[PDB]
Design a binder for this molecule. Structure first.
Ligand SMILES: [Mn+2]
Ligand SMILES: [Mn+2]
Lengths: 353, 353, 177
């Protein structure tokens, strides 16, 4: 105790300079590893012991109701320092750190899973080669697969471009699958107690934290989208979006959202601001599905505000449906919120998207 | 002589299989090195000695009136085996071979240019470090620069992607410049005879063959462009280009050629044929300026035939003006040729392009 | 506790084959890291607290009266399997493992020594470059030096011969200093 206190009195550090989004992204990794990593699975064991005690049943293994997300390196509302480059960077770093924490879990598993009793299904899944140390086999495969992707992200972090290894990890399903297979045989083969121990903990952490570690959320003001789309329209000679009434903006937006011909000029010269709005959607689009939890629109006032980001994301090339959320943060916007969403849900195109 | 004849009677090789565009591209490199490499510069010396003898003047050093080009791996008219991938490949290979022949010239120069007498301008150009072996310096720099680009293309030929070295050679100006500097000082400093020897030969070969070795020409039938642009238009719901009369095709083509908004769908699914037409223009566009001499349109019958390739090239992203040439190869097309070009030159847009 | 016991009932391993001197050398590393690594220094703190309490003085920092040695991969009396090759090997492996444990100690030190107040002598020893994070400097230098020798022994363990890095560690004086 005296050592630990002394450390604090003498260990003085004081930022001299403004931290950066990466630094702040790093503090969240520190919270994740010093507390959430153990905390979540314990929360899930207690909750489960209580369900069964008081109600008579335990939630199924596949059900992990908690997920952590971060706005660090994702929120640019009012912050010029959070550039598309920073987000790209932070997106990578999270993946690097998940590899770091997942390796510590996998090592443990590689040594404690010495069980040789396995199921037809599991044996099949390995069939020979490692059919004399089955569970260990699948944990050793994952270990390499994690070590490979780690190596790749430390290069990308460094600024080097080099093709990605065959066993590059991008989705949680890639960690889930093998881990879940071991669990199943251990239960089936009488090793329940071992299955429900550290495997269960890693299982739950995959779905709670997974590949990206902590999904990020992107956030930009509505105004910034209006300017990017205004500069675009004037360049194409179509008109000036930030002058058109709201019915015209929706008209233009629904027409283009349904259009099959692109709109974003291939080699264009926008202004710094607009380019940032455009590059950020390219990061979202470029990033593996499930890295980004949602696009938040601070200062959302009308239905065209939401439709605007769906247009930009479409132009950025995105293959999945990204949750867009208006942020009403004024008395009138709150007051008008309901009106704004009933119009949005009355647009058949929006409703099915 | 008996050895050499015997070789031919016993050295039997017989293709078992149809040669490939790369093979045919290779025979042209064989012609270039076993005969054109020495042949061109000799032709230029004799022509020059004759000008001065009979007329009283020699053409200036900067004037090399001969250039060699090849259709090998460039002509796909009627040939499905000449794919955009092959052309990409052959384009690289030529660069590799020019590096090969240019190194043999540069080695010679690195050892024979031991002159130490140089001009302010040339000394400035090196200024210290190698100011005690000036001409040799500039030839040693070029040697590394060539060796670097060689290394890079042998990787790309192999299918590996890795950033390009700082001294990657892409233009003839990069070989010309230093070489011409040496020539100038040697003339200035009294070493005319040495300047007009192997340096002159390499000088002339740079402009005659240069970086690409032999520029290629691309050739596709007009019909193929009409189909690609027809499939495109139907996908966008605009109409069907291969049904529109010729005045409509030009209308559509001039509108789009002047348009600032793209037309080619970002992630499209065309048919094999169309994709080939589209990918080939991407190679042209992707290739360094001066690699491709012209786009030839076999079976050109109307003004929209020429305008069609200018549209596709525009869509492929090209920064320079590519010479497009109609190929009239039928009695009526020959008969109509003049009419076809007077209309084309009456289009103000075409005339300035 | 139930998890831990279950592990033992189900985690069955049984040598099928005679262990080897390397294996036995490895069990001694396991004893060293799971118990001697913490055990020795604690023994030394308690012994020191007692000296001063009961007698009035503490032994000097430079006096470490305990040393551990092993006969594993060293004893060939009656054992044909302990060849000069094995000993060579085990000698290397120990060095590899010390690098492993010493890195864990050095990492801790690299982060906790953020002190900037230093002596003429110590500042001199770094003089500029890292004279704005002195103790950290010297721990970072050692970190590289350890990482270099680690790299070299993992190659030698592997059977590869390659010259030794400039900061190869061979003596305790190099860590002590
Ligand atoms: Mn706000
Ligand atoms: Mn023909």
């Amino acid at each position: 105790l005296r050592q630990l206190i002394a450390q604090s009195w003498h260990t003085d550090e004081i930022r001299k300079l403004r931290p950066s989004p990466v630094d702040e992204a790093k503090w969240g990794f520190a919270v994740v590893e010093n507390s959430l990593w153990q905390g979540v699975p314990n929360y899930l064991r207690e909750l489960n012991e209580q369900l069964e005690e008081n109600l008579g049943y335990k939630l199924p293994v596949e059900f992990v109701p908690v997920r952590f997300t971060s706005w660090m390196g994702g929120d640019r509302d009012g912050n010029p320092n959070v550039t598309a480059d920073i987000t790209r960077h932070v997106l990578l770093l999270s993946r690097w750190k998940a590899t770091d924490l997942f390796l510590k879990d996998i090592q443990v598993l590689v040594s404690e899973l010495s069980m040789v009793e396995a199921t037809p299904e599991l044996l099949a899944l390995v069939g020979e080669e490692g059919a004399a140390e089955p569970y260990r086999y699948l944990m050793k495969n994952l270990r390499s697969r994690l070590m490979a992707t780690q190596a790749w992200l430390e290069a990308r972090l460094k600024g080097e471009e080099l093709p990605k290894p065959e066993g590059l990890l991008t989705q949680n399903e890639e960690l889930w699958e093998p881990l879940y297979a071991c669990y199943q045989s251990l239960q089936a083969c009488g090793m329940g107690i071992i299955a429900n121990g550290d495997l269960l903990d890693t299982l739950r952490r995959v779905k709670c934290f997974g590949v990206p570690l902590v999904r990020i959320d992107i956030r930009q003001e509505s105004t910034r989208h209006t300017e990017a789309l205004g500069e675009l329209t004037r360049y194409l000679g179509i008109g000036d979006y930030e002058s058109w009434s709201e019915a015209d903006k929706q008209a233009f937006l629904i027409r283009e959202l349904n259009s099959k011909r692109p709109l974003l000029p291939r080699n264009w010269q926008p202004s710094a601001e607009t380019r940032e709005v455009l590059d950020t959607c390219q990061v979202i689009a470029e990033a593996p599905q499930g890295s980004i939890a949602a696009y938040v629109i601070s200062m959302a006032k009308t239905p065209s505000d939401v439709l605007a980001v769906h247009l930009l994301l479409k132009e950025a090339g995105i293959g999945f449906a990204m949750p867009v959320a208006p942020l009403f943060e004024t008395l009138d916007d709150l007051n008008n919120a309901n009106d704004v969403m009933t119009q949005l849900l009355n647009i058949d195109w929006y409703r099915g998207l």
